[PDB]
Every structure is written in structure tokens, then in C-alpha cells.
């Protein structure tokens, strides 16, 4: 359809969204392959990324792909995929699936005092 503008300032319109989204989702899965399986974060974001990849793979169109992905325009979907990739790399760096590092004091979260 060659959409003229996305309506968002500073967010350019992507010529080919399908191949870009497939590349981002495959990169996300490749990155998540390093997280241990028993971590709940890997399972949850693997499930949602697999769902979004199935939708973006079984859909030739763009407008109703946007309307059924429920993520606004396709360009902000691509932006969120890149953000999820960066988050997955940082999650690998941080390792937050480990147990709690410190108990709080006895009356730390008691309200009212």
C-alpha cells in the first residue's frame, strides 16, 4: 500500500516489515537459547515470541496483521522486538533467576507503623 507516514515523530516507515520481524524474532529465540530452561522468564517470553512469530509467519498482509497483532503500527512492533532483544541480552548479563539475595527487616513493609 506504501504507507506515507506512521504518524509518530521520529519513527520512520519500514519498507519490508515481515522479513524484519522474522529476523528479530529468530534473533530473540537464538539469544534466549542461552538462558537456563527452568527460568520462568525464558519460558514466558519464548511463548509470546513464538506466538508472535506464528502470527507474522501465517499472514501475507500488513494492515490486518497490524490489527490482529494488537501492537499499533508495525513499526512500533519492530521497535518492541528490538527492545525485547536488548532486554534478553541484559537478562543474560544480570541472571535474575537466582534466589533472593537478602531478606528485608522484620517490619520493613509494615504499614501503618
Amino acid at each position: 500500500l506504501l504507507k506515507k507516514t506512521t504518524g509518530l515523530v521520529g519513527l520512520a516507515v519500514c519498507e519490508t516489515p515481515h522479513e524484519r520481524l522474522k529476523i528479530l524474532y529468530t534473533k530473540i529465540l537464538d539469544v534466549l537459547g542461552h538462558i537456563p530452561k527452568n527460568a520462568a522468564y525464558r519460558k514466558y517470553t519464548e511463548q509470546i515470541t513464538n506466538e508472535k512469530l506464528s502470527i507474522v509467519k501465517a499472514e501475507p498482509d500488513v494492515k490486518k496483521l497490524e490489527e490482529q497483532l494488537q501492537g499499533g503500527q508495525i513499526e512500533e512492533v519492530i521497535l518492541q522486538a528490538e527492545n525485547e532483544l536488548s532486554l534478553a541480552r541484559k537478562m543474560i548479563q544480570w541472571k535474575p533467576w537466582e534466589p533472593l539475595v537478602e531478606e528485608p527487616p522484620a517490619s520493613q513493609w509494615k504499614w501503618p507503623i
Partner: protein
Amino acid sequence: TRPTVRPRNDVAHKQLSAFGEYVAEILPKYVQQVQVSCFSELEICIHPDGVIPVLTFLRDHSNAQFKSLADLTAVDIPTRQNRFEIVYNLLSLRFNSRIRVKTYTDELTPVESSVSVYKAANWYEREIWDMFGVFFANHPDLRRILTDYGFEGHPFRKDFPLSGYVELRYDDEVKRVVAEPVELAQEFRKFDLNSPWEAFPAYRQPPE
């Protein structure tokens, strides 16, 4: 309970409880408590050392997308050893939701600054310093933002009096605006307004 009582939102309560369990399951290294209030507000109380990852998760996970930092607050409760409670309010425009993240520090422990996650905090937590003395490590430009330049002490601490310790007046001998110890013409009348009868039985604390 129809006309004068605020109606409940049970579906929002269920959704917020489910998302709180989701967040507390994804990040067990840092979160310590997850609660939902009676008016459907989600509070996630976490360890201070996870103030950088958790927010980043809420900024970047596809199921959270809390892209907006609405507010940043410090609360002073002197009865705790970690007397300062630091509160982040996040708004997610994609899912139309709000979340609250609370950490705890005392006067001497520094905090990792959340400028790299949210840029607005670059002023907000700076104000916290100017009001509380909570040091934020790795801040780009940390200084006072509201008090006077020669101001000593942090005013929003609960051990700081309402009127300060100094006050300004013009002196013609030195031709200058000078500071002198405060002497009020009228003392601030303190009112003891608390009734000695218990009002809310649901919030009654167990005895000792």
C-alpha cells in the same frame, strides 16, 4: 452500599494480581513483596540492589511496556532502620496500566541511579537528594534543586522542624541580606487532634 460507597473493580483486581504473580515469578532475585490494594493498585516492593534490572524489565518486556515514568518519591519513616522508602510510579500506555515499585535505603547507603532507564528521573531523584540526603550513585549531575545555595540540612526529613534554623532579613550596616537564627513572633500552635477511640477495626494491629 449503592449510593455513597465506591464500587469495586474485581476484573482489574484479578488482572493486577495475575500480573504481580507473573513479575514475582520472572524476577525472584530482587522482588520481596507483591500486594494489590482494595482500590486496585499494584505495589511491588523489591530489594534496592535490583532497582536497575527490574525497572528495565518493566521498560522493555513485551507484556509490560511501562514506558512512562510518572513520578519518583521518597518517604521518611523514622521508626525503621531503613528510614527512606523510594517509590517509582510507572505508566504503561500500551496496556493502559500503572505500577508502583518500592525500595528501602537509610541515610548512608547509596542508590543506583535510574537515569539510564528513564531520563526524567535525572531531575526527580535529584530533588530527592535536595529533600532527603539520599545519595544516588552514577548520577550525571547531582546537586540541590529547590533549597537555597547556603542551605544546611534536608528539610523533608521528619526530624527537621517546620520553620528552619535560619531566616533572612536585610541589614543596613553591612548593606546585605543576612541570615539569623529564627525567632517567630507567633509560635506555631501544635494541635493534638487524634481521637482516643479506634476508627477502623479492619486495620487493627495485633498486640504485644
